[PDB]
Nucleic acid binder design. Structure first.
Ligand SMILES: [Cl-]
Ligand SMILES: [Cl-]
Ligand SMILES: [K+]
Ligand SMILES: [Mg+2]
Ligand SMILES: [Mg+2]
Ligand SMILES: [Mg+2]
Ligand SMILES: [Mg+2]
Ligand SMILES: [Mg+2]
Ligand SMILES: [Mg+2]
Ligand SMILES: [Mg+2]
Ligand SMILES: [Mg+2]
Ligand SMILES: [Mg+2]
Ligand SMILES: [Mg+2]
Ligand code: NA
Ligand code: NA
Ligand code: NA
Ligand code: NA
Ligand code: NA
Ligand code: NA
Ligand code: NA
Ligand code: NA
Ligand code: NA
Ligand code: NA
Ligand code: NA
Ligand code: NA
Ligand SMILES: [Sr+2]
Ligand SMILES: [Sr+2]
Ligand SMILES: [Sr+2]
Ligand SMILES: [Sr+2]
Ligand SMILES: [Sr+2]
Ligand SMILES: [Sr+2]
Ligand SMILES: [Sr+2]
Ligand SMILES: [Sr+2]
Ligand SMILES: [Sr+2]
Lengths: 81, 46, 194, 65, 56
RNA sequence: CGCACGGAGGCGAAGAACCACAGAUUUCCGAAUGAGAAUCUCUAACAAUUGCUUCGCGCAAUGAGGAACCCCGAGAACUGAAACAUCUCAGUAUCGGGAGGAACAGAAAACGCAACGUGAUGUCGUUAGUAACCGCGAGUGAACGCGAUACAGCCCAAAC
RNA sequence: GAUACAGGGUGACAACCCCGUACUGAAGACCAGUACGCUGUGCGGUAGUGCCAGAGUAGCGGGGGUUGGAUAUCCCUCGCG
RNA sequence: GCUUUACUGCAGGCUGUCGCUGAG
């Protein structure tokens, strides 16, 4: 059985979304929907997801831009992992 | 042209195959990518 | 004494005489409006069916098939051919109409195997044959000491390989001696000269 | 290496399920440090984590969950 | 207009594509039939005796 | 700790590596079977054709593959005949259908060294380039028998 | 040394350096769910009895294919039987 | 390749006959 979250996408553009827009970027499974990516992030990190934006990358994988709520800080979630 | 999800995965693989034989394989075998494809000079499928 | 079966047999010796003449004149009207392969509950010629191997048992199927009368439905040559190979009209197929009927029936019933067949008449444009087919997978047949041979793997698609009685007759295998030099053990082993 | 076949059989169906999620989290957190290209890595442990998850899933099949 | 070089310029149509069944770039996307394996035409794989010499 | 002799690290006396057998896992497309689609997608599926049937896809079957071999159908031409039409190439090439580990054949309405004789069937050697065919041209071409191989004979329909 | 002087490897020509090699022994697969053995059934003979024994068949004719098959191959088709 | 009252054949059309096909 396949897992939803593969690993975090950590690049410079991923950090600009983390420091400024409270968004965490993940490389997810391509069969996973926006709603499934939302649930899995909440169930793994104990955060509240507001919006998920996906893209099927030229690497064969799916990249997900996950926005957290104002109660949660993206920088603090990325530092523990 | 408009690409499908599968066409995108295939083009993605072709790009990954286009990389060089790593520096360490040259040392391990004690001394060449034959599948070197160029976007202009060569032709892909579909 | 005579069997009731012997009377069905004696009627079929002359299908254009007696009560059978009237019966066939009526039946063919319904048959001409029927399909290519029609499964029937009971055989029209019980004597012949039973004589050929039929039993009123589970997994034993009978089906009437209509095949067209006449020679080959041949297309004329579209390239260079010598005079001997330029014919269309007088060419006839090497397989008889009965064998075409058996094959069409076996295809309508992919799981079943052809046991035998017999003629049930003709009109001006077509011929009718009833094919006795058997279910090799039904336990009512796998336990039958008279029919269980048909359950063997090598009996699979027996009709398409000419293993039927009509198959063996059309292959020229009837005679055991003179005349069957190019036919036995097979037409193919003898270079296709039979 | 740290987890043997006998030790997984000494566990209960609920202890295997809990050990499965624990190793999956250690694998995801190892794949996170690899995504950033860290220096205090252990290349042999990330290999053993995959084999250990395979071992638990094999025992879950043998015992009937 | 010449049949050679000037007629080659109009060639931007996609016909033969990667096949779902065999993996060859022979699936005609307009006919929906593979020229290599026969996908779309037959359940059986396209094979012919002339693809080799008679006694081979 | 594959090919593959690197760097880092790791596993192995809790007996690893490696080999044999058995088992687990085994994505998507693929006969491809819920429907569609260039390997993806859309809303519970033996699709289709069949047998049985509790008449419900409940129980089953078929499909496709395989080096060639095998069996059943369709069936050329170059060529040879110093032309060419029958003939020949050849029932060959090629095509359609189908089985198996081998196929097919097979226990005489046989043979017919005519016998006071043989005794299912393949195959091998021979019979023999004989008999037979044939613009009686070029060419084509068996069988019975014999010596071997291996051997094995049986079941229905009907009578009652 | 040898029931082992087959072959290979090893820094150059190796029976005796190493793997093997002869000898002996083990396992699996095939033969084969066969042979042998066994259980059960029951072989056969006399006399009488025209009770039974497979039809578009046997066979004939028209037209074709095929074969060495010639009047005397095998088959298909149409009609008759 | 093409032509035709070249040789030989093959489709096709027309026509008789048999089968389908029966009653007065
Ligand atoms: Cl069959
Ligand atoms: Cl004799
Ligand atoms: K010729
Ligand atoms: Mg989008
Ligand atoms: Mg790149
Ligand atoms: Mg043979
Ligand atoms: Mg589908
Ligand atoms: Mg010529
Ligand atoms: Mg010549
Ligand atoms: Mg001459
Ligand atoms: Mg000849
Ligand atoms: Mg003879
Ligand atoms: Mg001939
Ligand atoms: Na990745
Ligand atoms: Na290009
Ligand atoms: Na069948
Ligand atoms: Na496997
Ligand atoms: Na099925
Ligand atoms: Na059903
Ligand atoms: Na010549
Ligand atoms: Na000439
Ligand atoms: Na001749
Ligand atoms: Na013949
Ligand atoms: Na005739
Ligand atoms: Na010309
Ligand atoms: Sr990239
Ligand atoms: Sr170019
Ligand atoms: Sr079949
Ligand atoms: Sr013009
Ligand atoms: Sr165009
Ligand atoms: Sr089609
Ligand atoms: Sr083929
Ligand atoms: Sr014998
Ligand atoms: Sr008899």
């Amino acid at each position: 059985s396949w897992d939803v979250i593969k690993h975090p996408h950590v690049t410079e553009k991923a950090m600009n979304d983390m420091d400024f827009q409270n968004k965490l970027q993940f490389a997810v499974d391509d069969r996973a929907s926006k709603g499934e990516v939302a649930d899995a992030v909440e169930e793994q990190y104990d955060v509240t997801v507001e919006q998920v934006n996906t893209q099927n990358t030229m690497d064969g994988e799916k990249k997900a831009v996950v926005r957290l709520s104002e109660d949660d800080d993206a920088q603090e979630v990325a530092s523990r992992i | 042209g408009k690409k499908s999800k599968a066409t995108k995965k295939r083009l993605a693989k072709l790009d990954n195959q286009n990389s060089r034989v790593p520096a360490w394989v040259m040392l391990k075998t004690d001394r060449r990518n034959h599948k070197r494809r160029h976007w202009r000079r060569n032709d892909t499928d579909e | 004494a005579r069997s009731a079966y012997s009377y069905i047999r004696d009627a079929w010796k002359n299908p254009g005489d007696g009560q059978l003449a009237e019966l066939q004149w009526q039946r063919q009207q319904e048959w001409r409006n029927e399909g290519a392969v029609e499964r029937i509950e009971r055989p029209t010629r019980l004597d012949k069916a039973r004589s050929q191997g039929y039993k009123a048992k589970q997994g034993v199927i009978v089906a009437r098939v209509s095949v067209r009368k006449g020679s080959a439905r041949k297309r004329r040559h579209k390239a260079g051919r010598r005079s001997k190979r330029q014919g269309v009209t007088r060419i006839t197929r090497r397989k008889d109409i009965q064998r075409v009927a058996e094959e069409r029936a076996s295809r309508t019933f992919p799981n079943l195997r052809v046991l035998n067949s017999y003629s049930v008449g003709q009109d001006g444009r077509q011929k009718w044959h009833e094919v006795i087919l058997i279910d090799p997978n039904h336990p009512a047949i796998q336990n039958d000491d008279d029919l269980s041979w048909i359950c063997a793997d090598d009996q699979a698609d027996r009709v398409f390989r000419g293993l039927t009685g009509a198959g063996r007759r059309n292959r020229g295998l009837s005679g055991k001696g003179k005349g069957s030099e190019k036919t036995r053990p097979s037409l193919r082993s003898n270079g296709g000269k039979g | 290496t740290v987890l043997h076949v006998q030790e997984i059989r000494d566990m209960t169906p609920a202890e295997r399920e809990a050990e499965l999620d624990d190793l999956k989290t250690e694998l995801l957190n190892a794949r996170a440090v690899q995504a950033a290209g860290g220096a205090p890595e252990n290349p042999g442990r990330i290999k053993e984590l995959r084999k250990a998850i395979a071992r638990i899933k094999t025992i879950q099949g043998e015992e009937g969950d | 207009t010449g049949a050679g070089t000037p007629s080659q310029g109009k060639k931007n149509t996609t016909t033969h594509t990667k096949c779902r069944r065999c993996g060859e770039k022979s699936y005609h996307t307009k006919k929906k039939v593979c020229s290599s394996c026969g996908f779309g035409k037959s359940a059986k794989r396209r094979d012919y005796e002339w693809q080799s010499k008679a006694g081979e």
